[PDB]
Every structure is written in structure tokens, then in C-alpha cells.
């Protein structure tokens, strides 16, 4: 599932920068994918009765930490200060060769 | 500890594909290790008063994402749809050169 | 934020081995950084009304799993048995080229 509610909380799967409907990446660029991830996350959270403001913890998995400034810039637009708790790191690879995956936990 | 209950929830340590008793890998193959991980997880969850059906979130750490189809096939047997929330990624290395590590969170 | 309380629980961001005040690494060595991470974590937890003994789950992200014995030794001093649930793995890279990042979840 994309999200599981256990009841004070909701647990999101790691989100990729895919057009939900089609399962293809929005583009090859981390800049588009990051924003698509965040958009996708907002949809999943809202459907779940959560929202960006109820997120308590995120984890950002990157293909390349050199992308961090662009990623942070975009992320900060959806999660302005004070923002969720967060961890960030560069992994060896992501599913479907994605540039970025973000998972999160939110309150209901 | 292998698991900590905080009380609506239980938090599992990342599980490796070891024969619990002996601490040696079941084999070198991701196919055996994945299944051993899942078996080990079921034991830990049950001992804890949880079970596969109460798992809400998993994280699969892989040595090689090329293993994903085999891993998914096995995983899907223990976690049929609708399955827990889940993240998957390839790490640089795992403890003891394991092929796969899975952690999870479950309800009580 | 460094930590978010949702209320039975507190979620910590991944902690690096920086002198909090200055934002520079305590040193280049994993041995100093690991200990600084743990110290930093204790401060964040206490400020939050938690403490090392209320931590339920940690995740250790390493630059090099060859560092595991030194890391484990230090960690075990702050988290003696029975210790939190825990996952450990080697990532491709960490923010600011850190040697180690640890995140955690604790009870209040």
C-alpha cells in the first residue's frame, strides 16, 4: 500500500517522481522528480486525512548528494520551517533508477 | 534488542538472513536470505505479540537492486496485498556482507 | 526541526558529529564523530523530555562499514543492553561528507 494508518499515525511508502496515473517518471531530472515526489506525497497524505503540516518525520534518499541544494530548495517550499524531522543520505541506487525517493510519517 | 514495544507499536531491528540459533547466513544467495529474513521477522513479531498482518511499515535494504524481482516475489508471499507501507533501496554495503536487510514497524 | 514530538513519541532528525554551536565537525575521524553524534542526540532527546533510556529505535548510517567495531563500541556506552531496536548499513555518502549519521525515535 502507499500508506497505512495506525491510528494516531500514517506511514507512507517511499515515493518516486512518477506521474501517478502512468507510472513513468515526470522527467529524468532530479529537479522535476523532487517536485513530483512532493506533489505525490501531498496527495497521499490528504487522501489519508493528513497533510504536509501534519508530517513529523521524513527521509530523503538521493542518487547523488550533489543534488542537495536543488532538492532542499524545492522541499523547503512544501515543508517550510519549522519543518518535519528529517534524514538525508545518498544511496547506491533507487528503484527504476530514480533520482530521489522520500518516505514519511505523519499524524492524523 | 531485536524488538522494542512502545505500546501500541513494536519496532524491529533490521533483520539479516541468518539462522537465528547459529548466526551464520542460511546461504550466500539473496533468494534464501530474503526468505530467511522474512521467517526470522515472523518469529520476532509473533514473540512480540504482533504478526505479519499487523506490520504497518517496512524498509528493504538491498546489496543489489538487480535482485528486486526475486526479493519482491518472496516478500509478496509473506506480505500479500494490501501490504505494509514500504521503502526499497540499494545501499553501499550491509552488515556481514548480507544481501538483504529488512526492518519494520508493527501494531500490537 | 531537530525533533518533532507526536505526543507519546519523539522523532529525531539524522544527527551528524558537529559541534552544535559552530556547525563544524568535531574532527575528521569516525571515532570522534560517532561520540559527538551520541552526545548531540542526548541533548536533543533531553530537551525534548526524552532520554537515551527512552529511545526505542535507531538507524546508523555509515560511510564505511569497516568502522563498525569502533562505532559499536562507542554506541554501546550510550546504549547499553538491552538497547534500542537498531538498523545499520553503509550508504554511498552522507551530508557534508560525514562519517556517520544516526536518527532515532523515542518515547516521552
Author numbering:
A (entry chain A), B (entry chain A), C (entry chain A): 80 to 187
According to the publication:
Arabidopsis thaliana RidA (AtRidA) is targeted to chloroplasts. By converting the reactive enamine/imines to harmless 2-oxoacids, RidA preempts damage to BCAT3 and ensures that the isoleucine biosynthesis can proceed. In this study, we determined the crystal structures of apo-AtRidA and its complex with pyruvate, and analyzed its structural basis for ligand recognition. The RidA domain retains the basic overall fold, and also preserves the homotrimeric structure with the characteristic interfacial clefts.
The current crystal structure was produced by the construct starting from S68 (named AtRidA-S68), and it diffracted to a resolution of 2.0 Å. In the final model, residues S80-L187, as well as 85 water molecules are resolved. Each asymmetric unit contains a single monomer, with a Matthew’s coefficient of 1.85 and an estimated solvent content of 33.7%. The model shows a mixed β-sheet packed against two long α-helices. In the β-sheet, the strands are antiparallel except for the outermost strand β4, which is parallel to β3. An extended loop L91-E110 is located between β2 and α1. AtRidA-S68 crystal structure is disordered in the first 12 residues, which accounts for the missing strand. The space group of apo-AtRidA is H3 and through symmetry operation, a homotrimer can be generated. There is a central cavity in the barrel-like trimeric structure, whose height is ~31 Å. The buried surface between the neighboring monomers is 1306.2 Å2.
